[PDB]
Design a binder for this molecule. Sequence first.
Ligand code: FAD
Ligand code: FAD
Ligand code: E98
Ligand code: E98
Lengths: 499, 494
Amino acid sequence: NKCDVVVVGGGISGMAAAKLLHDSGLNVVVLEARDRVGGRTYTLRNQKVKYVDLGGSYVGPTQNRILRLAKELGLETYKVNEVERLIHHVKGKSYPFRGPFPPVWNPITYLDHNNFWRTMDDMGREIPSDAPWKAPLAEEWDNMTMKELLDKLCWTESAKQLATLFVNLCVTAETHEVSALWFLWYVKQCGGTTRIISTTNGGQERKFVGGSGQVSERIMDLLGDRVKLERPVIYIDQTRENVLVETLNHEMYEAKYVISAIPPTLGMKIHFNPPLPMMRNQMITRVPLGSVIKCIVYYKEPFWRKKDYCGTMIIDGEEAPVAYTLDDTKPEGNYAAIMGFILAHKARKLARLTKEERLKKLCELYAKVLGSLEALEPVHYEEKNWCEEQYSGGCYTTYFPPGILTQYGRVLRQPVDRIYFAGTETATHWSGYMEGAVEAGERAAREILHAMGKIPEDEIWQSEPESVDVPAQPITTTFLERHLPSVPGLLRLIGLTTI
Amino acid sequence: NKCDVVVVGGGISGMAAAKLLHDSGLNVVVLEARDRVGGRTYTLRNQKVKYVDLGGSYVGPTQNRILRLAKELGLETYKVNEVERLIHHVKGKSYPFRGPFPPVWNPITYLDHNNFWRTMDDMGREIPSDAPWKAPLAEEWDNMTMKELLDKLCWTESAKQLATLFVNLCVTAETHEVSALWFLWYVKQCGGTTRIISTTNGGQERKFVGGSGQVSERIMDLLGDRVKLERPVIYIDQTRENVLVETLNHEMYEAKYVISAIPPTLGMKIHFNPPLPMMRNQMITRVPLGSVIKCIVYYKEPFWRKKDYCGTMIIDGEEAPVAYTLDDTKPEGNYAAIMGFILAHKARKLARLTKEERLKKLCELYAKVLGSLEALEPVHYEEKNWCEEQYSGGCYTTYFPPGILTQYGRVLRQPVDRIYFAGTETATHWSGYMEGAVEAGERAAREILHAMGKIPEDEIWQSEPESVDVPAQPITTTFLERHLPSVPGLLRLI
Ligand SMILES: *Cc1cc2c(cc1C)nc1c(=O)[nH]c(=O)nc-1n2C[C@H](O)[C@H](O)[C@H](O)COP(=O)(O)OP(=O)(O)OC[C@H]1O[C@@H](n2cnc3c(N)ncnc32)[C@H](O)[C@@H]1O
Ligand SMILES: *Cc1cc2c(cc1C)nc1c(=O)[nH]c(=O)nc-1n2C[C@H](O)[C@H](O)[C@H](O)COP(=O)(O)OP(=O)(O)OC[C@H]1O[C@@H](n2cnc3c(N)ncnc32)[C@H](O)[C@@H]1O
Ligand SMILES: O=C(Nc1cccc(F)c1)c1coc2ccccc2c1=O
Ligand SMILES: O=C(Nc1cccc(F)c1)c1coc2ccccc2c1=O
């Protein structure tokens, strides 16, 4: 019934918010729709796998908030296997490599790839993390899709195909589905292309020992009975002195303030009194989540390592069900496994199949890419299609179609009377990730602390000390990377000389 | 409590479905979220206006279902005034014209405009009304926006500005927001460019005497206490023998079947048990409605008619708050008024202003376009910003961003166990309109009658006899319109 703050949603964002508020001495309640906490994180436990992350899993350098939160809760990380060679599989053949970017030998294609990644970051530097709609060309860039941008930028099919994979993998959406402005913002707010694509020194460096679901679970243990499971929120009434929050199972909660810690569009599942202001009313119908099936195939041994492959496969084109894999073997070397994503339209297309049919297509793919008959001998399989989740809407995160971020983006974390907005979507650093969930939950909690006169305004946004356990190597470029011409740059140089 | 069919939503679609089911002898209940029926139609009555449609208003030839339903309920139509000249206002000057398409005189611009309209209809001929995702180039066209298509097709800024206005006015959305496939389908399923843009012999020919809200009101009158107002549906449970439908005010309704007659995305306001299938779960997050403020400025007299202007203004460019107007005067020449739409991004931009500030901007625009100081002397004003509506999501209808129609379009009218889907968005002819609302409501009702064994499969979709009161005249083209080259066509020859 009565409390200081109701937090709607018990994912990492809502739990981080509730914890901060609880630690500050307030009375918080967390209302969670599901029979579990963690949301878009979910750690399955059984005897065949021990534990496995079926939702969000990876953490890495520069994600200091999630690292700090997890460390405080008694959790540890380990490094995702990247000892041996990565594979880029292109036009039916595998090309092993080292370093984060799949390399290319053809001089023209080399210039085109170099320019593609460089230009993503060049454009990113024009986009403020906390206000992407303030970019000087925000309108122009928001009114084109990523498909249009790649069609203009990539002078080779090689670069276009890799760039397309990059978009699909980063945002679980097609290049023609997403705004160029929003995509460029998304990458820049993770620290740019190198940081977002890298295992070693990037976003995919590490996993939590025992699964990421422990973050939300251990906060629930700290909060005790303040977390209410199977309480989907249906109604928020701000017409009276205290806010009234009603759940589907016929309970009413009364609070001074509310934190909405659910994906933005999932706000539609709540009926509001008074109605939401116009811009938010429409925004929450314009912001879908992407589409992904996360699939883990288990093997007797991590046999790929014996061929000097680390387990990372980057697999171009249409026929492959999975475009990206990582080694998911436990740090101890057992429960050998390959994690792969079925992305964007393929998550829709292949959902028609049975679990056994998907397993077979994945093993056949892995056998070809790894040149290994052992890939046809799985011992176990787990998967999760996040498109089917009523209380997520998709994974990893919300994407913005063309035109939406400039028209509606400014209201994403704008309070609505006594409702404040958390959720990874409202973060300014690693939005879309567990890191962003912590940033947003803690920031929303401090907004309320400020509204209550407990902290000054300059304490709402708080910097985070660098992790001593996961130091961040800087992102660097070479002279040639900075100054080599694009393909059209080279052609201009050719035209000028012959004159 | 217990009934045969629960209809969620008391707009035209839900009302049409409930009426059909009721007339066949089933016990129906309509659960309506608002304190009124009509949904995206809303007729306001007061002494100053008599009545005014602040939502959907226009009907025309080929919309035989809405015309038949309205006639049965005792309604009459009158013609939107198009006796005098239309105005196209371009680069600060008014150019009066007759006929539906704003004309041009420059030979290159002429070829470009001609080709633009012709191409929209050429592309439409390959898009099945009942399955646009089966177009031969469905993927190619769905993966581009209308902005990309227009940038490719229009060699002149003149044609591109008019085409942009056309898109904005048709679908209350920006060219870059919408799938080209979806937009081309939308036009084709209203009978093509001429039919969709025309007042005389098209979609804007007529209005209902006393307002379109009377359709939904008069069905509510027939149904009596079967219509439950202020019953927003929050929960649908299909796990047991009968379907259970719960409302926000705590009531529980039990039925054999349910019709969802709400905009597709407003399905998100309902919690489902079991969860919806994957494709629908995601679809209902991918389908926004457009943005519009409908504004009606009243005057002492329809003064524009004295200058041989009918009151239609087509107003290009960014600065104008309103891109399109029609004469809203009543049939007797009284309650003189101009109806104008503030479209798409301008609805968002100008919503910050006060009502009085919007009135001043509109009057000054109209004074310029009509070339009359009389436009600065309004006697009354009414407006409605549909972007504010929790239980509509916007107006006129749902648009599909790039990539969505091909991936999720099949899902829209697919039943989910014992839930069938009505709403104008599910129609195959004049989807987006009151006509499509009737088509979809009656079809969803007949799906349930078929499920019950009461009618055969072949009676689910029913043709409609042509209205005697509003007959359609054929859409024609000239030899030169059909065969003149495009701009790049003319360049190939040179
Ligand atoms: C799904 C997924 C996500 C993911 C990823 C791979 C997959 C398959 N990989 C990631 C990774 O490797 N590293 C990483 O940092 N992130 C990764 N992601 C994304 C990550 O999981 C998310 O960014 C993050 O978990 C989101 O946290 P947040 O707290 O912002 O949101 P949530 O988890 O969705 O929590 C929302 C909770 O709210 C409940 N809910 C929903 N509606 C209601 C109502 N009406 N009432 C009450 N509760 C509600 C949800 O049930 C959920 O628990
Ligand atoms: C808004 C608008 C619409 C419009 C237009 C101009 C404007 C500003 N001009 C039109 C025109 O000149 N001619 C024409 O034929 N159409 C025009 N349009 C569109 C037209 O109004 C619509 O196509 C039509 O009204 C749609 O009817 P439909 O019955 O399909 O949908 P609806 O009116 O939105 O009705 C839905 C009802 O459902 C209720 N609702 C919503 N959620 C719930 C829940 N959860 N529970 C119960 N009821 C719910 C709504 O309140 C509504 O009444
Ligand atoms: O862009 C990525 N990786 C990537 C790795 C190699 C080449 C390439 F083009 C892209 C990733 C982006 O975001 C993610 C989110 C959750 C899990 C993995 C990833 C990526 O690997
Ligand atoms: O396209 C339209 N009209 C139009 C009329 C003249 C020139 C032009 F480019 C467009 C209309 C489209 O759909 C509508 C929907 C509700 C009300 C009016 C209209 C139109 O007039």
